[PDB]
Amino acid sequence: STLLYIHGFNSSPSSAKATTFKSWLQQHHPHIEMQIPQLPPYPAEAAEMLESIVMDKAGQSIGIVGSSLGGYFATWLSQRFSIPAVVVNPAVRPFELLSDYLGENQNPYTGQKYVLESRHIYDLKAMQIEKLESPDLLWLLQQTGDEVLDYRQAVAYYTPCRQTVESGGNHAFVGFDHYFSPIVTFLGLATALEH
Secondary structure, eight states: OEEEEOTTTTOTTTTTHHHHHHOOOOOOOOSSEEEOOOOOOHHHHHHHHHHHHHHTTTOOOOEEEEETTHHHHHHHHHHHHHOOOOOOOOHHHHHHHGGGOOEEEOOTOOEEEEOOOOHHHHHHHHOOOOOOSSGGGEEEEEEEEOOOSOHHHHHTTTTTTEEEEESSOOOTTTTGGGHHHHHHHHTTTOTTTOO
């Protein structure tokens, strides 16, 4: 099986939630491949790279976890290719917040400098899914303490989906480790049929 982790804006595989998850997965589920790609800064490119990884593993068991903007990408991927996904404090309308991020930018971890343009916003916006066709595939993890995103949008948008809403906390999501095992089970990446 494969666990595809999708990081957020100006982030990278060094994301805390990803590295801690990877260490845990290594001890408890060594046969689960943890894929945490470094996403390019452009929406279309990031989407194509993510789609390519999916089709390389769609034959076997594959599940996705996406945080912040990564949750938007995860949702798109999930519904389009019918893949289970857990979205952590996901951006529902990232095209709105990123419009304020237009212009010169730099990924502090890769050092890559880029210019976020309006067309990039269009590309992200074009991925918007107004009606979830396969809600049973999504699981929303959200903390109302998030000061980057307004939890209301996520709670309403993922209404037909399983949800775990915690009051307090923050955008980074405090205590993500508690969900490691629940996530593997939700994504159906482990099995006991061979025990």
